């Protein structure tokens, strides 16, 4: 309870938590429903700077793709932790009863099978980030005492 | 930051200052013999040269473990001159010129540790 | 103090964290299925990793 977590003011996340009949998500909804500070932000960018200014006090709940882009393609002062709570999926559409659904669906599955969508994602999300990948090799937490502690 | 080479450059400033007093006392000993018992001034010179050569041996040893090989090259020729003193074991004009260069070399390299140390501490 | 903090609580970390990390160390011999989806996917792969 030390970190207050909030979501968008009017979005799909708030509607999902309002109809989530899960004990893990139910207790989270009643906590976010009654809170003295602002646990709902109208703009996703206003909630982003709120997390950067809270410094470990506001955990914003957003989608996976938007979280990975705002972490890599922006000054990386925040990071994504944990797996996805629910499961969704994007998709291109087509008017009801149109001849441009069959071949289009076959082209989407063909691109996803040939490893093309994974390449386009890794190019626009990682190969073009703002702060980049500084020290890609994750420095393991050295259990030994550092030198600066007794400097 | 705080590296092992940064700490090695800090111990040199305290130790190289003591090497400065040795080469200065050597010029005073040479000046006294030039003006003019005699064994006292020469025996005291033999007791002073041994620590001066042994202390510099640590300067070539500390930087060896500190991976600062760009500074070791500035001290290897100084240690090679000590080998000629131990291998052989007028002379007044020769020793005078062989001592003024020590004061200049031990001072120009002294300012390096005063600046190369800052090039690592504040560069965090 | 540090030796007392060591024996009190233990924090064992995994030697790896992703697939793009083990492809650079090459210290752990990793294996897959003989014939299936994983083998066919790793066969025709355009990404470098």
């Amino acid at each position: 309870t030390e970190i207050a977590y909030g979501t968008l003011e009017a979005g799909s996340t708030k509607e999902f938590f309002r109809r989530s009949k899960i004990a893990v998500f139910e207790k989270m909804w009643t906590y976010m429903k009654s809170a003295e500070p602002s646990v709902f932000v109208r703009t996703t960018e206003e909630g982003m700077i709120r997390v950067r200014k809270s410094k470990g006090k506001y955990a914003y709940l957003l989608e996976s793709t938007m979280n990975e882009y705002i972490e890599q393609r922006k000054p990386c002062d925040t990071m994504k932790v944990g797996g996805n709570l629910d499961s969704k999926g994007y998709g291109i559409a087509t008017p009801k009863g149109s001849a441009l659904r069959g071949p289009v669906n076959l082209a989407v599955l063909k691109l996803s099978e040939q490893g093309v969508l994974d390449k386009l994602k890794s190019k626009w999300w990682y190969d073009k980030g703002e702060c980049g990948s500084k020290d890609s090799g994750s420095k393991d937490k050295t259990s030994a005492l550092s030198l600066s502690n007794v400097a | 930051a705080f590296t092992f080479a940064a700490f090695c450059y800090m111990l040199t400033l305290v130790l190289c200052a003591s090497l400065i007093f040795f080469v200065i006392w050597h010029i005073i000993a040479f000046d006294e013999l030039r003006t003019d018992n005699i064994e006292r001034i020469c025996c005291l010179l033999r007791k002073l040269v041994v620590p001066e050569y042994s202390i510099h041996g640590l300067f070539c040893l500390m930087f060896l473990c500190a991976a600062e090989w760009v500074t070791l090259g500035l001290n290897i020729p100084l240690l090679f001159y000590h080998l000629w003193r131990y291998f052989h074991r007028d002379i007044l004009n020769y020793c005078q010129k062989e001592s003024w260069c020590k004061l200049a070399f031990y001072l120009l390299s002294f300012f390096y540790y005063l600046y190369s140390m800052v090039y690592t501490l504040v560069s965090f | 103090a540090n030796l007392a903090a060591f024996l009190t609580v233990e924090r064992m970390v995994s030697p790896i964290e992703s697939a793009e990390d083990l492809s650079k160390q090459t210290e752990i011999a990793y294996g897959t299925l003989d014939s299936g989806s994983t083998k066919e996917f790793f066969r025709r792969s355009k990404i470098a990793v």
């Binding site: 030198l147 | 700490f7 130790l15 620590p51 640590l58 | -």
Partner: peptide, 28 residues
């Protein structure tokens, strides 16, 4: 409990303190 960078700093600080004390006990 102590990183390898500190163990290398202790030995050279030990010898450094020793030679400094020897130099101080020499001018007298």
């Amino acid at each position: 409990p102590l990183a390898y960078e500190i163990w290398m700093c202790i030995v050279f600080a030990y010898i450094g303190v020793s030679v400094v004390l020897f130099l101080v006990s020499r001018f007298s």
